[PDB]
Amino acid sequence: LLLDTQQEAGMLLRQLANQKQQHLAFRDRRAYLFAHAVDFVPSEENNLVGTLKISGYVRGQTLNVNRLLHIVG
Amino acid sequence: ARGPKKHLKRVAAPKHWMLDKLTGVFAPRPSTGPHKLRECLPLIIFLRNRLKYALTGDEVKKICMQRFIKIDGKVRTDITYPAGFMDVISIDKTGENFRLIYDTKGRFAVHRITPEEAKYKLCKVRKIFVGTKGIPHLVTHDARTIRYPDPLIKVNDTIQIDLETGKITDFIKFDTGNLCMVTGGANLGRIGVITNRERHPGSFDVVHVKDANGNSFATRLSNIFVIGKGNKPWISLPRGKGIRLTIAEERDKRLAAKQSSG
Amino acid sequence: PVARSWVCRKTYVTPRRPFEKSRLDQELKLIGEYGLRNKREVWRVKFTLAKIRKAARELLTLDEKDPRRLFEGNALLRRLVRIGVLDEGKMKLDYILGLKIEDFLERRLQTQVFKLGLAKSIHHARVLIRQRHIRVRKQVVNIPSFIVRLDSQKHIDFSLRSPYGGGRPGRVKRKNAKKG
Amino acid sequence: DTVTIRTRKFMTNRLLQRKQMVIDVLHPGKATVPKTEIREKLAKMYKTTPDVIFVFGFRTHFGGGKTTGFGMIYDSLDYAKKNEPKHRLARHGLYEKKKTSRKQRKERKNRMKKVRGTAKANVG
RNA sequence: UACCUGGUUGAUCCUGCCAGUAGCAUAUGCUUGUCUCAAAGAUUAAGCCAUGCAUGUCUAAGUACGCACGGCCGGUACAGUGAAACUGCGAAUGGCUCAUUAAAUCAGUUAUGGUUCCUUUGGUCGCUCGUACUUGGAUAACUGUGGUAAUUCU
RNA sequence: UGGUGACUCUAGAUAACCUCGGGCCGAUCGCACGCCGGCGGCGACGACCCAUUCGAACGUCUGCCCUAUCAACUUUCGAUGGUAGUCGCCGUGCCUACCAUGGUGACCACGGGUGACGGGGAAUCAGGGUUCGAUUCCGGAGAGGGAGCCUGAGAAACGGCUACCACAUCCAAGGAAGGCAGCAGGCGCGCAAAUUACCCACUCCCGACCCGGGGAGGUAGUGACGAAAAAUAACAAUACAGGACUCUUUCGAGGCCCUGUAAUUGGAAUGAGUCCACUUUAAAUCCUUUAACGAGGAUCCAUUGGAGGGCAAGUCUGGUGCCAGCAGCCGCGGUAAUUCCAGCUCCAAUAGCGUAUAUU
RNA sequence: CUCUCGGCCGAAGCGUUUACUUUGAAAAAAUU
C-alpha cells in the first residue's frame, strides 16, 4: 500500500484491522505482557533492590501468580 | 424478462446495417414504427454511416432537431425512426431526395431520386377489411390505412400513393408477367417478372420469378413486392438493375474496372 | 460486455518428435542459410505452407468445373503468383503441391535485401532492417519477415533518413567528429 | 518550408454549416506538426479566418512521413459555437468546464436527496 | 504428417498393460529487455458484507405570488431566468450470477380461426335529435407552532 | 358488402340492455397574427375504438447425459376422458360438481443421480470420433430462504412493500433500520482471480428533453491466462585454418571463397534507457513523430531443463560409498558411479522453460 | 398418367402410401 494522505491513513488502518492474524506459538502457550507503566520502590537503597510495579495488558493465557515471571533481558 | 426490451447490441443487430464490431457495445435500437426492426434503417445509420453527414450520434441529433429530415413528406426528429422499404427521404436544405430500395446483396442502397419522383411511393396491401357502417379499408406494409379504396384492389397488389394527400393514385394487380422485387430471403433485392405462383392451402404460396438474364428463382409470397406493369418499372432503379451477378462475374467486372482505370 | 475482439491465431505448430536428428539438422540448415532467430520462424513458414497445401488438397477433390473450385483456386493461385513463389506458366492447382519451404523463405525482406546487394551477408540484412535503414516504396519497413510482393520488389531502397541514404551521419560519427 | 497540407475526401455539410475534410500533412524531417499552424496553412488554403476552423485526430505514420487528421471549416464562428463539441471549443478557449468531480456531485446529490423543501438548497 | 519407442525371457515370437511422446487448459516454480492485442473471485462458499457510488427527468408549449434574481414601466391580470413543490413519465430496461432445473429449459419448425399489448405509425374523434365569452371543492411548496435519543419520521 | 383452405369472420337488419366501484362524444397549453360587428393558419398535450410496431403468453412436431443393486407407475388429496359451470388476458382438470375407468411402460416408463442451466460455440482429430461449453450473443432462472401482494401497459419487482424463517445494525431499552449473484472494496473460503482511480468525449439508453442523468459503457491501473511482432550484435583489416581455380611429375606457388580462436586491432550503425516538445485524449498515459545524451566486452553481462536407454547431449576431473541421493519407466549408488553432489564441457527450446492435475 | 371447365396450354384429380435420392426455400450475428 502507499501512505501519503490521511485518507490513505484511514485505508491503511482499515486494512490492519481486518486481516488474517498469524499466530506465533510461543506467544500462545505462555502468559506475556508489554509494560505500559513502571513504578519502583526499594526495600533497601543500599541493597539497590526493591519491589517493581509493572502495569499493562496481559496477552497470552491466564496469568497465575504462583508461576515465576521472566523479564526478557 | 419482465417487460419490453429497449437496448440492442451491435452483434445482434441486422447484418445489412453493415455495422462495426469494435465501435461499441450497442447498436441503435430502432423505434417502434411503420416497419419491423429487422427490416428497416434507423435514421442515424442512414444519416452518418451511409451519407457521412455526421460523425457522432450527437451530430445526428443536431441535424434532426433543426428539422431538415423528412420521411414520407413529414418531418421526423427521432434519430432511431424506422425508415424502411420504398421510403423517400427528403433533405430540403441540400435539396436532395433519396429512396430506400434494396441492393442485390440485400442491403439498403442510397438511391438518389429526382424531386418529381419524391412525390409518390408504392405500397403493398397487407389486408382489406370492411368496417364501421360498411366502409372498406386498406392496410399497407407501411401501416397506412386508407379508407374508401377501389373495389378491384385485392391483397398482395401494389398501390401507388402520393405523399402530400396520402390517397391512392393507381394500382397494379399481382399477376404472372408483372415486374417484382424480392424483399426477403436469400433472393433479397432481385428484380424479375413473375412467371408462376403455386398455391399451398393452409401454408405459404411459393412465387416463381424470372430475371431479365433468365436466372429463375422462387420466394415465398410474403417476400414479393410488385413494382411495375409488365416488364417496365414504376419507380427508378439502383445502379445494378436488380440482377445478382455471380462472384465470378463480380471478380471479372472488378478486374476490368481496375484495368480500365489505372 | 466490452467492444473488444477476442479472435486470434497461433501462427506455428511444434513438431511431434522432439529429438530427431534429421529434422534438427535440416532446421538448423534453414536457420543458418536464411539467418533466422530460432526454430519458430522455420515452424511458422512450415505452418503457412501446410495451410496452403491443405487448401489445394481440398480443392483438388472437387469437380474440375465446380464453381467453388474454380473461384477459390484462381484466388489461391493468384496470391501465390503475386508474392513470387509460383510463376505464371506454372499456375495450376496441382503445381501448388510442388512448393517447398525455401520458396517462401526467399520472399522475406531479409533475403531480398541481401540478394539486392544492399547488405553484405544475411545477418547484416537482418540487422540493417532492424536498424530502420530499409524502406520499401516509400514506407520504412522495420520487419524482416515482411513478405515482399513481386511488384513491390523492384524498388527496395535505403530509407532517405538513413546514414546510408540521404544523409545525417549518426550518433557515433557525430561523437567522433566532435573530438578535435 | 517542407511542410505540405493536402486535402482528401471533401464534403460541404450544408446541414451542419461546415466543410468536412481529411488533411494529409507532409513533414519529412520535423516532428508531428502542431495543430495551430495546421490551422494557419488550412486558412490560407481555403481563404477563411483561422478562428473558425477545427482540426483533430492526427496520427503520424511509422517512419516519419505523413500525418493524417480530420479537419472542418465553419461558415461562421456562431455556427461553430452552435455545432462543435464542447471539448473542441475549449481547446480554442471558447468554453470552460466545471471543476467539480463526479464524486463530489454524486455525494451532493444523495445528501440533497435526504432532505425536502428549500432546505435542499442549504445542504451541499 | 493416416507415425510410434522402452519394460515380462537364458534367448525368441506373442498377448498385454505400464512408461515415454505431442497438444489444450488450470495451478505453481524459476526467469524475464521492447511492442501490439488481451482473459481475469466460474470451480470451494447462490458464503457473509464496513464505506462510497450504481436512476433519474422541462420544453416556446401542465401548475410560478420564493425580490432567489440584473430587470422592465410603472394602476399596465401574467415581462423574462428560476429554486422548491404539485402533476406527468421512467424506474419491468441495463448489470450480475448459474443455485435450481432431464421432454423441464432450449433449438429448429409451426399455431393463436384461443389472447393481451405503454409507446411509434396510420385511421377515427360536429356519424348520438337529448355558467358555456368557462363550473366546483380541496391540497403542496411557502408563513408559523411542535414532538421523539434516533430514520428520506411526521 | 368483403374475405379465408376453412368461422360461430367482417359488414348488415331487428328487440332490448348498457354496471354510480359509471365508456367514448376536448371546460388543456404555445406561436405567429390575418381577412369580410364574425370567421380563421401551424403546433403541443388529449382520447374510447380499429389497425401497425416492440413484444409477451400459452400450444404443434422432432431432439438431451448416467443408472435395472430403479419394473411397473398414476388415481382416497385430478390420475385419463365426457357434460355444465367457475376463474382467468385467452384455449385447457386450471378449479368445482356429476359421470366414465382410464393414462404411461423393456421402443426403458416410474424412481434416483449429474463436479447438469440450454443453445450459438470450443479443444482435439486422417476418415469415423472423444471431450468441453460458469463465461461478454440468443433463451431461461434468481436476488439470503420460502410465501404473499401494491402500483402499473408490463413485476408475483426485491438498489418496491408485507410477513415468517436464518442472520444481523443502532439504541436513552420505549423503539428504529436491513439484503453487493451491480461497480469498486473487505472478510471468509481455498491450489485458484485486479483499482475503495478518471469521464459521460465514444457506443447507446431514459426523461417534460437539441441542454439533465447513466460504476450501462468508455479510459487508464493491476495483469508471463493466452495470441501476434520482435533486441541481446554487424562489419573490415591482420595471424593461424580448411575447401576450391591456375601453374607444377610431385613437393609446392598464388588473388578465390569460407571459418572461428582472436587472453588481435579498428571505427561505423543502432535501439533499450534518460529526456524538451508536438501528437493522442473529455483530461491524460501509452504507441507513432521528433531535438540533446546514450555500446567494447571486468557491459546495456538469458534463462530453464538435461547429458546410461527411450531421447539430442561426457564412459572427463573431485567428493560420496546400497549412505546421501537420483530415477515418469528400465534402473543407478554396496571403493575404478557414463545416472547422486559438484567443476568444466556439451545438448534442447528460448523471453521463456520446468512441475502437478483434468482432458484429446 | 388422363376425363371435365377456361386461354397447342392453364385449372381438376393425381399415383396405394412411404422410406431413399436430387432440387428448391427456410434456417440471427459473432465463431469457422
Q: Any idea where the domains of chain B sit in the sequence?
A: 1-116, 121-171, 174-244
**Helical H segments across chain A, by residue range:** 6-17, 25-29
Cell of B27: 447498436
- Our answer on whether D and B touch (3+ beta-carbon pairs < 8 Å) is yes
DSSP annotation of C42 reads: H
Q: Is the dihedral of CA B156, B160, B164, B167 positive or negative?
A: negative
**Distance separating alpha carbons of residues A49 and D52, to the nearest angstrom:** 94
Q: Taking Cα atoms as reference points, which of B109, B75, B110 lies closest to residue B90?
A: B75
* Domains of chain D listed by start with CATH number: 4-120 (3.30.70.3370)
In the 8-state DSSP scheme, what is residue B46? I
Q: What are D11's strand-pairing partners?
A: D20
- CA A11, A14, A17 angle in degrees (round to 5)? 150
Domain segments of chain C: what residues?
Answer: 18-180
Mapping DSSP to helix (H, G, I), strand (E, B) and coil, where does residue A7 land?
Answer: helix
The CA angle B59-B64-B66, to the nearest 5 degrees, is 100
* Burial class of residue B180 in the structure, from the number of CB atoms within 10 Å of its CB (0-12 exposed, 13-18 middle, 19+ buried): buried
The number of angstroms, rounded, from the C-alpha of C9 to the middle of its chain's C-alpha atoms is 18
**Is the CB of B23 less than 8 angstroms away from the CB of C4?**
no
- Give the span between the Cα atoms of B56 and B63, in whole angstroms: 11
Nucleic strand G under 7 Å from the C-beta of C7: yes
Q: Are D68 and D61 in contact (CB under 8 A)?
A: yes
Protein residue with the closest CA to the C1' atom of nucleotide E119: B32
Mapping DSSP to helix (H, G, I), strand (E, B) and coil, where does residue B220 land? Answer: strand
A52-73 core/surface letters (b: 16 or more CB in 10 A; e: else): eeeeeeeeeeeeeeeeeeeeee
**Annotated resolution, angstroms:** 3.1
Q: Is B251 exposed, middle or buried (0-12, 13-18, 19+ CB in 10 A)?
A: middle
Chains B and A touch (3+ CB pairs under 8 A): no
- Give how far B148 is from chain C: nearest CA, Å: 52
Interface of B with D (CB under 8 A): 52-54, 56, 58-59, 62-63, 66, 68, 91, 93-94
Q: How far is CA C17 from the centre of its chain?
A: 26
Is the C-beta of residue B21 closer than 7 Å to nucleic acid chain G?
yes
Q: CA neighbours within 13 Å on the CB side: how many for D65?
A: 10
Residues in Cβ contact with A67 at an 8 Å cutoff, skipping those fewer than 6 apart: A31
In chain D, which among 23-82 make CB contacts under 8 A with chain B?
Answer: none
Considering only CA atoms, give the Rg of chain C: 21
Residue located via cell numbers 541493597 = A47
By what method was this entry solved? cryo-EM
Identify the three-state secondary structure at position C60: helix
Would you tell me how many other CB atoms lie within 10 Å of the CB of residue B156? Answer: 17
Residue B198 Cβ < 7 Å to strand G: yes
Three-class SS state of C133: coil
> Degrees (nearest 5) of the Cα angle C5, C7, C11?
140
Compare all CA atoms of chain D with the CA of C141 and give the residue at the minimum distance.
Answer: D63
Would you state the cell numbers that stand for residue B131, as one nine-digit string? 368496417
Amino acid code (one letter) for C108: R
Query: D38 CA to F261 C1', in Å?
Result: 60
* Helix residue ranges, H only, C61-146: 67-83, 101-105, 109-115, 122-130
